Amino acid sequence: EAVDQNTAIVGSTTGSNYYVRILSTIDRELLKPNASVALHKHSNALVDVLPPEADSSIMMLTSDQKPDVMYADIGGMDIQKQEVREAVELPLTHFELYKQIGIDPPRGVLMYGPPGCGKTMLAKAVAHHTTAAFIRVVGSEFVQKYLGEGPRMVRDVFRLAKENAPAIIFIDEIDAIATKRFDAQTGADREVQRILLELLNQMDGFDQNVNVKVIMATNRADTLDPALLRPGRLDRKIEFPLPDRRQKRLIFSTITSKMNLSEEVDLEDYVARPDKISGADINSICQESGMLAVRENRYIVLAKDFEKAYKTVIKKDEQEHEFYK
């Protein structure tokens, strides 16, 4: 921040707050509350900030530079996409409609359940059409040996997003940073969960308009803090709906429409017999019987391989705690 006339406080890239009389000819206009200012070699004097910026990490793409995967193959998630349908395209392409309706667009998006996974690959989907940032980020990859790199990332993550906006950011498996802990060795992590708090702080600057889609995923909801689900943070929860007769017959048809299929193949018997348990991971199970064609010397997979995929995964009834009404 700039404290008062002609001076201000700044941390270096070594993370120490300073007090310096700023360069005379530029007092304010480009300095701004939050930027990265180049500090004098000897003195660390306040002189000028970045353009801003080329920023630092990631920075975006992953579509034109690959990879990309077509979502249209899997249609069993349609009702799970119903959220993402209304919660992505129009929120980005219209900020004006949210003035007209009288309802504010939420940043809340959740994901959950894996396996069955979906999730990260479903985040690869909308990268086909909507052109924006896509950042692969976890909780544990941006852990550093120094505590101050968090805002050197997440505070830059925000200033690189809204400045390069329209842009979107998905944090894959955010659940790593939600752990409750004390010891001052984690005091850096306490500071990175203060950075999670500092990114919790400065992400609300997205309000209003341009721009973000806050989309979230966790396989376990235990340690997620109330301020992470805070009103105005997660207002929309997606869970994992289990694939079922529609989704099964969809996951039955979508896999075999590519690989060699037979008149021998009737999958309506398998929308019942294996469907009594799974569930799953059927997508890989759909590939498992395909992986059973490599046992040969084969062209079209047999039915004994269909059941072999079902007899390999999974068992059992069972059980001492399960079978007890």
Name the minimum Å distance from CB 186 to other proteins. Answer: 6
181 counts as binding other proteins under rule CB under 8 A: yes
- Closest to other proteins by CB, 220 vs 273, is 220
Report whether 115 belongs to an annotated binding site.
yes
- How many Cβ atoms are within 10 Å of 301's Cβ, its own excluded? 25
- Residue of 57, 62, 130, 254 that binds other proteins (CB under 8 A): 62
| DSSP label at residue 174 | G
Report whether 118 belongs to an annotated binding site.
yes
* Nearest Cα residue to 306 out of 276, 268, 278, 267: 267
- Closest to other proteins by CB, 30 vs 97, is 97
33 counts as binding other proteins under rule CB under 8 A: no
Tokens 């830059």 found at: 156
> Would strands 169-171 and 136-137 be described as parallel, antiparallel, or unpaired?
parallel
CA distance 222 to 207: 28
- How many Cβ atoms are within 10 Å of 255's Cβ, its own excluded? 21
Is residue 155 within 8 Å of residue 34, measured between CB atoms?
A: yes
Determine the angle formed by the axes of helices 282-291 and 245-256, rounding to 10 degrees. Answer: 30
65 counts as binding other proteins under rule CB under 8 A: no
Report whether 119 belongs to an annotated binding site.
yes
Report whether 290 belongs to an annotated binding site.
no
Residues 234-293 that bind other proteins (CB under 8 A): 258-260, 280-281, 284-285, 287-288, 290-291, 293
| 3 state DSSP class of 10 | strand
Residues 96-135 that bind other proteins (CB under 8 A): 97-98, 100-103, 114-117, 120, 124
CA distance 174 to 142: 11
CA distance 18 to 12: 8
Name the minimum Å distance from CB 246 to other proteins. Answer: 18
- Order across the sheet with 169-171: list the strands: 136-137, 169-171, 214-215
304 counts as binding other proteins under rule CB under 8 A: no
56 counts as binding other proteins under rule CB under 8 A: no
The interface mask with other proteins, positions 189-228, x = CB under 8 A, is: xx--xx--x--xx-----------------xx-xx-xxx-
Name the minimum Å distance from CB 304 to other proteins. Answer: 16
Q: Is 311 exposed, middle or buried (0-12, 13-18, 19+ CB in 10 A)?
A: exposed
The interface mask with other proteins, positions 140-179, x = CB under 8 A, is: xx-xxx--------------------------xx-xx--x
17 counts as binding other proteins under rule CB under 8 A: yes
Q: Which residues define the annotated binding site for ATP? A: 113-120
From the annotation, which residues make up the binding site? 113-120
